[PDB]
Amino acid sequence: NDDIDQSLIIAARNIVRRASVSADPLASLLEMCHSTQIGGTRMVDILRQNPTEEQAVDICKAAMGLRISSSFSFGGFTFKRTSGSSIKREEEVLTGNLQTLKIRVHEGYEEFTMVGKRATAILRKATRRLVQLIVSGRDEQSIAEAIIVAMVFSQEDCMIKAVRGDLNFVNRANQRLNPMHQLLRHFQKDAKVLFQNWGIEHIDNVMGMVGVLPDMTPSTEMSMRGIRVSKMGVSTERVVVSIDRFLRVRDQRGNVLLSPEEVSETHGTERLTITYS
């Protein structure tokens, strides 16, 4: 049970990475899934029975019409909506380097939990606004990673304005990343202009919680607008999802739940033998 899961993830990640470089990735992935065995059992038979929710694995499940977790993955983090709703409106925005970006802006009030491996968070947000972020983590590194993802996800104008120079990030297949991911890789290379330009505010010490400044220094006095660090940020609903040619998994409203771009780069050595085509 434990070894099949470890091995299935490794096989799924390899398949999505190989498929993603092909002209029609969906068809490539479907080939490899149907002609791959893990410890002697067929991979499609493992997918039908195994309950693991992982980004590469869930892309493969979707590919063959299996139900998956309704969560979505942004910046490595799993997001579950705990409350509220939104609608979608495409808008042109202008970066700090005067580059147009067409963005599907979400309009509404929504509350989510973010769960990464080294940090978790509660996010509350409105139309192009971070309302509040309560974040936990292992360290300075891991906490800042979660803050950058929440800031980009919020769609705020100060985040858009803090962009410096052009955004032409590409995937392994030489195709441009879509705008939200363009923004995310930019601020993942450097979040300094982002944090400086975000804004600061006075806070009252709720015990358990602390402020954090644009240089990541804690404080009891001030914090970055909306953001508080904490010490412990507190089950699966399977649903039908869709898949396209480029392995983008979507909900019924067309929000991208998963993609090649949200599959972890970790190479790892399988515990049960994996035989490909």
Ligand X SMILES: O=C(O)[C@H]1[C@H]2CC[C@H](CC2)[C@@H]1Nc1nc(-c2c[nH]c3ncc(F)cc23)ncc1F
Q: Are strands 77-84 and 110-115 parallel, antiparallel or unpaired?
A: antiparallel
Compute the distance between CA of residue 182 and CA of residue 225 in angstroms, rounded to an integer.
Answer: 24
Compute the distance between CA of residue 143 and CA of residue 155 in angstroms, rounded to an integer.
Answer: 19
124 contributes a contact to ligand X by CB under 6 A: no
How big is the CA angle at 181 (ends 176 and 187), to the nearest 5 degrees?
120
104 contributes a contact to ligand X by CB under 6 A: yes
The closest of 97, 178, 182, 191 to 141, measured between CA atoms, is 191
Give the binding range for ligand X (CB under 6 A) out of 9-17, 102-110, 219-227, 268-276: 102-110
Q: Whole-number minimum distance, CB 44 to ligand X, in Å?
A: 4
- Give the burial class of 76: count Cβ atoms within 10 A of its Cβ; 0-12 exposed, 13-18 middle, 19 or more buried: buried
Residues 155-174 that bind ligand X (CB under 6 A): 155
Count of chain residues binding Ni ion (CB under 5 A): 3
Count of chain residues binding ligand X (CB under 6 A): 18
86 contributes a contact to ligand X by CB under 6 A: yes
Q: Which of 60, 74, 122, 162 binds ligand X (CB under 6 A)?
A: 74
Q: Applying CB under 6 A, which residues contact ligand X?
A: 30-31, 34, 44, 64, 72, 74, 86, 104, 106, 110, 153, 155, 180, 251, 255-257
Which residues are near Ni ion by CB under 5 A? 178, 180-181
